Every structure is written in C-alpha cells, then in structure tokens.
Amino acid sequence: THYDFVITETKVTRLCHEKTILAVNGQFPGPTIYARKDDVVIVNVYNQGYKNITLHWHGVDQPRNPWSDGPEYITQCPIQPGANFTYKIIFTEEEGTLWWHAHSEFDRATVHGAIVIHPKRGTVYPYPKPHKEMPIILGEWWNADVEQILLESQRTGGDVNISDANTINGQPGDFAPCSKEDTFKMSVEHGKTYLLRVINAGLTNEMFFAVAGHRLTVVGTDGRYLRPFTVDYILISPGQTMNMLLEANCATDGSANSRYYMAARPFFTNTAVNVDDKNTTAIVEYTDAPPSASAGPPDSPDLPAMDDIAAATAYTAQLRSLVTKEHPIDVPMEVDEHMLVTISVNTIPCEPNKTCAGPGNNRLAASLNNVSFMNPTIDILDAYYDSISGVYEPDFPNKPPFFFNFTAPNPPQDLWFTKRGTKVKVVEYGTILEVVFQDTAILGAESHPMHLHGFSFYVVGRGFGNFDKDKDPATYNLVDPPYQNTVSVPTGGWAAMRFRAANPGVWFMHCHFDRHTVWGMDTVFIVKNGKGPDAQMMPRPPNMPKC
Ligand SMILES: *[C@@H]1O[C@H](CO)[C@@H](O[C@@H]2O[C@H](CO)[C@@H](O)[C@H](O)[C@H]2NC(C)=O)[C@H](O)[C@H]1NC(C)=O
Ligand SMILES: *[C@@H]1O[C@H](CO)[C@@H](O[C@@H]2O[C@H](CO)[C@@H](O)[C@H](O)[C@H]2NC(C)=O)[C@H](O)[C@H]1NC(C)=O
Ligand SMILES: *[C@@H]1O[C@H](CO)[C@@H](O)[C@H](O)[C@H]1NC(C)=O
Ligand SMILES: *[C@@H]1O[C@H](CO)[C@@H](O)[C@H](O)[C@H]1NC(C)=O
Ligand SMILES: *[C@@H]1O[C@H](CO)[C@@H](O)[C@H](O)[C@H]1NC(C)=O
Ligand SMILES: *[C@@H]1O[C@H](CO)[C@@H](O)[C@H](O)[C@H]1NC(C)=O
Ligand SMILES: *[C@@H]1O[C@H](CO)[C@@H](O)[C@H](O)[C@H]1NC(C)=O
Ligand SMILES: COc1cc(/C=C/C=O)ccc1O
Ligand SMILES: [Cu+2]
Ligand SMILES: [Cu+2]
Ligand SMILES: [Cu+2]
Ligand SMILES: [Cu+2]
C-alpha cells in the first residue's frame, strides 16, 4: 500500500520521433496502482522533472480528503521541480478499474496509469473469476512537446493541434509509421476468459473500441459494477473506464485466424473541425495455434463510422448499475436542489494589439452556465480553509443567465461570447442535487464527458434537444441508473444526474476534454462541514505545496 512515483524526464520514440516527456518512474504509460476495496494507499510523488505538476486519483471519492485530490489551483498549488508531496488515497465504495493522471496543464498526455481495485479479502467478483486481466489504456501521442502544443494554442487563441496518433498502452499499433514492431499484444488461451480494463486516457475524443471476432460482456464502469450486457463494440469517453469480459473461443486447430485486432477510433461529429481520426490497433494472439494460423494479417473488427451518433447512443443506453444484495444502490429520490448547467464552447474578445486564430478571429474559450472558469493563483481549497477573500466568488448559478433554444443549430454570432470568472457553488453537507447538463449548439453541438471529483453520481436521464423540466423527469431511471464519475452528455442533448453531497471538501467539476478544461468548461463544489466528526473535512496536511 505504498508507492514512490518519481516524475522523470524520459526520452521516448514513437512514429520515429524522439522527444523527452514527463513520465512516472520512466514508464509511459506509468505504473498501475493495485489495491483492494477499502484500502488506503500512500503515494510519495518526487518531481524530478522540469515543470510544476500535480497528480489526481481519478474516480476516488477521497472522503473528507480534498488535500490529496490533485487538481492544480483547485485543491493544491503545484509540486515544484525538485519538490515532493505525499498523497493519501482513501478507497471506499470503488471496486473495479480507475486510473490516475497528472492534473496540471496537458501533462496527463503522458503522465497517467491504471488503478486496479480488486474485491477485498473474503469477497469475490459478481462474475466468474477471469483467467487473466489486462489494462487497455487508450491514449494520444503528439510528436511535438505537449507543452508546446498547449502554449501555441494559448498564444494564438485558436484550436489545439490534433494528435499525430491514437494509441493502445502507449503504442499506435500496426498501421502507423515506425510502429508495427512494438504494437501492443496480449496472449490468450482457448477456452479462457479475460477481463479487459479499458481506460480512455486520451485528451480529446470519445472512442469506439472493439475486438475482431470477440464479443465483449461489459461488467463495470468507473469502479461500480453494471448489469452485464454483451456487445460487438463499446463507446468510451475520456475519464471513463469500462470493464468487460472477453471469451477466447476461437479454434486453435488452424481453421481460424490466430490473431485478432483490438481497435479503437474516435466518435466525432463536427465535420468542420480537424480530428485525429487515425485508428489504433493491438493484437490478441492465440498462442497454442499452429504458425500457419498467423500467416496473414490479424482479423479486423467492424467499427462504427466516426460520425455514427446512433451507435454511440445505442451503447450508452445499455448502461445500468448492478443492483444485488452484495452490491446495493441508493438512488436519491427526493431532490433538495435542481441545477441546469449549459455547456458551451465560446469565444472571448482577442486581446488589444493582437490577432487571434479562433472563430471570427476571437479567442477560444468555454463555459458552464456562461461562466468561463479561470484558475486562481491561490488554490481554492487553501482559500476556503483560511477564509482568504478575493480568490473565488461563491455564486456559481443554478441555471443559465439567459434561456434560449439551446440546441438550435448555428446560433447567431453574438451568442458565441462568454465571460471569465472564478465562481464556485457552496452546498451544505448532505444536500441532494439533481444536476442537468445541457449542451448548446454554440460553435457546434458536441458530446462533452462531464466529470465530478469527490463523488460518483446516478445518471437518471438523458435525451436529445432541450431538457424539459416538466416532462423529461417522468421517464428517469430511478431504479438502476448507472453510477458513474464521468457522463457522456449527448451531442446536442442533455443528461441528468443525482448525488448526495456528503463529502466535505472542495471538488472540481469539468469536461474531461483537456482543451475544454483549460478554456474554462469547469466549476467547483464546496461542500461545507456537517455535524459530527464524520462530516468534517480533514485538516490541512503540514507540507502542502506553497502558492
Ligand atoms: C454570456 O456572457 C457574455 C458576456 O457577458 C454575453 O455577451 C454580452 O451580451 C451583452 C448583452 O447583449 C452585450 O451588451 C455584451 O457586449 C456582450 N459581451 C461580449 C459580446 O463580450 C452573452 O450574451 C452571454 N451568453 C449567453 C447568456 O448565452
Ligand atoms: C509553478 O508554481 C508556483 C506556485 O504556484 C508558481 O509560483 C508562484 O507564482 C505566483 C504568480 O502567479 C507568485 O505570486 C508566487 O509568489 C509564486 N510562488 C513561488 C515562486 O513560490 C510558479 O509561477 C509556477 N511556475 C510556472 C512556470 O508557472
Ligand atoms: C520532501 O520535501 C520535504 C519538504 O516539503 C523535504 O524536507 C524532504 O527532505 C523531501 N524528501 C526527500 C528529499 O526525500
Ligand atoms: C500545429 O499544426 C500546424 C499545422 O496545421 C503547424 O503549422 C504548427 O507548427 C503546429 N504546432 C506545433 C506546436 O507543432
Ligand atoms: C486502420 O486504418 C488503416 C489506414 O486507413 C486501414 O488500412 C486499416 O484497415 C484500419 N484498421 C482497422 C482495424 O480498422
Ligand atoms: C494598438 O491598438 C490600438 C487600438 O486599436 C491602435 O490605435 C494602436 O495603433 C495599436 N498599436 C500599434 C499598431 O502599434
Ligand atoms: C428549437 O430549435 C429546433 C431545432 O432547430 C427546432 O426544431 C424547434 O422548433 C425550435 N423550438 C422553438 C420553440 O423555436
Ligand atoms: C475545437 O473547438 C472548436 C474550434 C473551432 C475553430 C476555430 C478556428 O477557426 C471551432 C469550433 C470549435 O468547437
Ligand atoms: Cu480524470
Ligand atoms: Cu477526477
Ligand atoms: Cu479532473
Ligand atoms: Cu467538452
């Protein structure tokens, strides 16, 4: 239950391009954290790299413990080069796959890895114990330094350059230049079942994923078991994890291929904007088959077309919490407070004496309820703890300031603009929230993967168009809605979720597309202390990074 994570400058080559990246212990992707349900894990982080950095344990509630949650300028100031910080990871309700990643700038492009939370001693999986288990991390690779990719978009005010490859476990796969030799490969044995722990650690796109010749029985997401269902492909959004069983059924006698492509490719609908549409591949290989069975190329799956919204919707519609006596559910039935949160890509005016590259030559931005989040320079959590004025404003609104036909295509240019602020939403301990995310069509309808730190939540409804507060709740799933930490809000649509705010602390909420995070598609929940020691935020650890 103790790890040393040294942030290192590491030379890595992909697509024949060598560069120095930040990595953990020289590994890209980084090491997997292994735990069992309800463990406490300690990670000493030593920043031996060239820049400010933080680490985040994605999907871990961290009860009463925002100090170890990670998001830069939200719960901590950064770990400076040459400094160190000890994170305490408090696992509670989570069982399944999570992941960890840098939570500063674009550093998580290479600084990330898996978290595996096994059943605790004396308990078992709700499904037959898999023969083997394999993290399958979907990611992106840029030939350029990711810091320079970010910095250039900051200077120009235009869009972030697309990645050069999509990757599986850091490897672009068979169809990329200078990649075929090191494609990720896993061995399978006829008749055995494998748990694929799929993590979308890319920065930019939701991804379709499939394995040639093999159906996938999905059994969990975001550290919570799901009602099992079997499919030919999955959809998975940045931030999300999906666990699924693969049954190695194919014949190893020479009558069938012995190699099968695992493959992923983006789900993306904005035909006017560039996208890294390259597929990424890995190889599932039956090892006990005759060498003639691997004579040709591996079999290829049928992936949905990149713009197949129906295929995305059809996967997401199947997600439901597993509800049993060993795995109960607690859907909040009486809501204390409703929020409608419009999600928009935006512009702000270009700075004086400068030309910008965003739409209308303005500067790109993004917003929740038309507030474009701006990081403070004193982190929110310290400001809240010390009662420091002038850092944040505690009036993030429960509804957008101006109602309009949110999802009507091509809104007029005047609705593009937003305004920066550092606003948070303060709630009393135990408040039951229904949060409805409403995509707008400003600058293009788009599915946003909205993520809430400190909590998972029940996704009780979703639809296309404008949420109707007097009609859509009538068909909410109040019985077994999926319990997630990151929700794909529909393209040009809405998603409703509920949770009890019973974790005292300071909790980031944001789109998990990093470009939207930095553009300001974020806010913060401050959950005040309740009554009793169990409802009190932990005290500040002695050696927090200084601001
Ligand atoms: C989001 O906020 C922006 C900025 O406050 C709003 O744009 C302003 O709208 C007012 C009223 O029409 C104008 O007088 C200002 O000139 C605008 N500021 C600009 C363009 O920078 C925008 O209308 C809001 N959008 C919503 C609520 O959808
Ligand atoms: C790395 O992080 C530190 C801590 O947040 C930054 O240092 C602070 O910068 C602010 C200005 O934004 C100053 O008011 C503080 O006095 C600084 N504190 C220090 C130097 O201990 C630093 O700017 C960050 N580095 C980069 C390159 O962004
Ligand atoms: C970690 O940082 C502290 C200061 O916060 C320092 O005192 C300590 O020696 C460091 N640990 C090392 C270098 O192993
Ligand atoms: C981003 O892409 C453009 C090509 O469209 C290129 O001119 C530019 O150099 C790229 N930026 C970086 C930082 O590599
Ligand atoms: C991936 O893309 C390459 C290049 O377009 C294509 O030749 C290959 O068939 C694709 N692989 C899969 C599994 O879709
Ligand atoms: C900067 O912008 C102002 C306002 O548009 C303009 O009057 C001024 O000439 C500019 N400065 C230059 C071009 O050096
Ligand atoms: C809102 O926009 C949609 C899509 O353009 C349109 O079909 C609908 O009629 C609009 N609703 C109103 C009230 O104008
Ligand atoms: C990815 O974000 C966007 C970029 C642009 C392009 C701006 C430069 O012209 C347009 C719409 C978007 O949603
Ligand atoms: Cu995350
Ligand atoms: Cu998170
Ligand atoms: Cu986050
Ligand atoms: Cu987004």
From TrEMBL:
Glycan attachment points: 84, 161, 279, 353, 405
Positions annotated to bind Cu(2+) 1: 56, 451
Comment on bound cofactor: Binds 4 Cu cations per monomer.
Residues binding Cu(2+) 3, per UniProt: 103, 453, 510
InterPro entries (alphabetical): Cu-oxidase-like_N (IPR011707), Cu-oxidase_2nd (IPR001117), Cu-oxidase_C (IPR011706), Cu-oxidase_fam (IPR045087), Cu_oxidase_CS (IPR033138), Cu_oxidase_Cu_BS (IPR002355), Cupredoxin (IPR008972), CuRO_1_LCC (IPR034288)
Domain of life: Eukaryota
GO cellular component terms attached to this protein's record: apoplast
Role this protein plays: Lignin degradation and detoxification of lignin-derived products.
Originating gene: lac3
Similarity field: Belongs to the multicopper oxidase family.
Protein's name in the database: Laccase
Lineage per the UniProt record: Eukaryota, Viridiplantae, Streptophyta, Embryophyta, Tracheophyta
Domain Plastocyanin-like: 7-121, 133-287, 396-530
PROSITE patterns per record: MULTICOPPER_OXIDASE1, MULTICOPPER_OXIDASE2
BP term (GO), one: lignin catabolic process
Matching CDD domains: CuRO_1_LCC_plant (cd13849), CuRO_2_LCC_plant (cd13875), CuRO_3_LCC_plant (cd13897)
Disulfide topology: 16-178, 77-547, 350-356
Any one GO molecular-function label of the UniProt entry: hydroquinone:oxygen oxidoreductase activity
Major localisation: secreted
UniProt subcellular location: Secreted, Extracellular space, Apoplast
UniProt: Cu(2+) 2 binding residues: 58, 101, 512
Cofactor(s) listed: Cu cation
Keywords: Apoplast, Copper, Lignin degradation, Metal-binding, Oxidoreductase, Repeat, Secreted, Signal
